[PDB]
């Protein structure tokens, strides 16, 4: 159990309040820079049909969630490896030590690494323990990223709008079409309201988070 239970409480409360239909809306008053996320997914590559999912964190680290449900992570120095089993047990390595065991998986990771650097661009670049990708799925409209620190990210394909939900600080960071990185306290959104756009994706978020809960 990550903090999805209670992520759901935060969203149910925000949506039940209907921040879209509100007399005077001052979305700006709902912002709070003390809730700015440290980690989010900046790039991702779906290759589940074969290997699994590769992604890049905003800290320039790269991970891969394989079809066997193990995760390999390369740190920002390009040498340190962290490996997480199904069981969630961790162990640490370096590429340079050339471990026989992970040779096949290290190689696949490096492949994702290169693709991402060559063909993909940094989502939320302008902005100032390392988690892993616990689980993920995509709809026809979005891809849903569940990190091990409890945060859940939703990326909407059509217009490149992203949500980062942070259960701990009870927060949400919304990246709009103009690529503006605005962070809000979910509770303050109830009070001050928000625009129809954001209020609809918070709804979608809840449906998605609920979908994460019934698929453990
Ligand atoms: O570098 C590789 N492909 C590549 C190398 C040189 C030139 C091209 C042609 C190139 C192109 O047509 O622009 C492309 O398809 O990327 C392919 C690959 C590196 C990894 C590949 C994998 O087998 C791999 C395995 C797991 C995940 C991923 I992304 C890729 S192939």
Swiss-Prot record:
* Induction description: By growth-stimulating agents.
- Tissue expression from the record: Placenta and colon.
Q: Which residues carry this modification: Phosphoserine?
A: 5, 80
- Entry PTM: Ubiquitinated by the anaphase promoting complex/cyclosome (APC/C) in anaphase and following DNA damage, leading to its degradation by the proteasome. Ubiquitination is mediated via its interaction with FZR1/CDH1. Ubiquitination and subsequent degradation prevents entry into mitosis and is essential to maintain an efficient G2 DNA damage checkpoint.
Q: Which residues carry this modification: Phosphothreonine?
A: 128
Q: Where is this region: Important for interaction with phosphorylated proteins?
A: 160-162
Subcellular localization, as worded in the UniProt entry:
Nucleus; Chromosome, Centromere, Kinetochore; Cytoplasm, Cytoskeleton, Microtubule organizing center, Centrosome; Cytoplasm, Cytoskeleton, Spindle
The record places domain POLO box at: 40-118, 132-214
Q: Where is this cross-link: Glycyl lysine isopeptide (Lys-Gly) (interchain with G-Cter in ubiquitin)?
A: 122
Q: Which family is annotated?
A: Belongs to the protein kinase superfamily. Ser/Thr protein kinase family. CDC5/Polo subfamily.
| Disorder cited | Defects in PLK1 are associated with some cancers, such as gastric, thyroid or B-cell lymphomas. Expression is cancer increased in tumor tissues with a poor prognosis, suggesting a role in malignant transformations and carcinogenesis.
Task: Describe, as the record does, how this protein assembles with itself and its partners.
Answer: Interacts with CEP170. Interacts with EVI5. Interacts with FAM29A. Interacts with SLX4/BTBD12. Interacts with TTDN1. Interacts (via POLO-box domain) with the phosphorylated form of BUB1, CDC25C and CENPU. Interacts with KIF2A. Interacts with CYLD. Part of an astrin (SPAG5)-kinastrin (SKAP) complex containing KNSTRN, SPAG5, PLK1, DYNLL1 and SGO2. Interacts with BIRC6/bruce. Interacts with CDK1-phosphorylated FRY; this interaction occurs in mitotic cells, but not in interphase cells. FRY interaction facilitates AURKA-mediated PLK1 phosphorylation.
What protein am I looking at? Serine/threonine-protein kinase PLK1
The taxonomic lineage of its organism, from the top, reads: Eukaryota, Metazoa, Chordata, Craniata, Vertebrata
Q: Which gene is the coding source of this polypeptide chain?
A: PLK1
């Amino acid at each position: 159990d990550c903090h999805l239970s209670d992520m759901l409480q935060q969203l149910h409360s925000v949506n039940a309040s209907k921040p879209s239909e509100r007399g005077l809306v001052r979305q700006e008053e709902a912002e709070d820079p003390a809730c700015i996320p440290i980690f989010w997914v900046s790039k991702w590559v779906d290759y589940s049909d074969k290997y699994g999912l590769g992604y890049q964190l905003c800290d320039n680290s790269v991970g891969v969630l394989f079809n066997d449900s193990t995760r390999l992570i390369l740190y920002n120095d390009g040498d340190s490896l962290q490996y997480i089993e199904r069981d969630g047990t961790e162990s640490y390595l370096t590429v340079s030590s050339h471990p026989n065991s992970l040779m096949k998986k290290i190689t696949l990771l490096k492949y994702f690494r290169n693709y991402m650097s060559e063909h993909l661009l940094k989502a939320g670049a302008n902005i100032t323990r390392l988690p892993y990708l616990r689980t993920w799925f995509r709809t026809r409209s979005a891809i849903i990223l569940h990190l091990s620190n409890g945060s859940v990210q939703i990326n909407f394909f059509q217009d490149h709008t992203k949500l980062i939900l942070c259960p701990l600080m009870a927060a949400v960071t919304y990246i709009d079409e103009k690529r503006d990185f605005r962070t809000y306290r979910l509770s303050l959104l109830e009070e001050y309201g928000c625009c129809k756009e954001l209020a609809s994706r918070l709804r979608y978020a809840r449906t998605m988070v609920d979908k994460l809960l019934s698929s453990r």
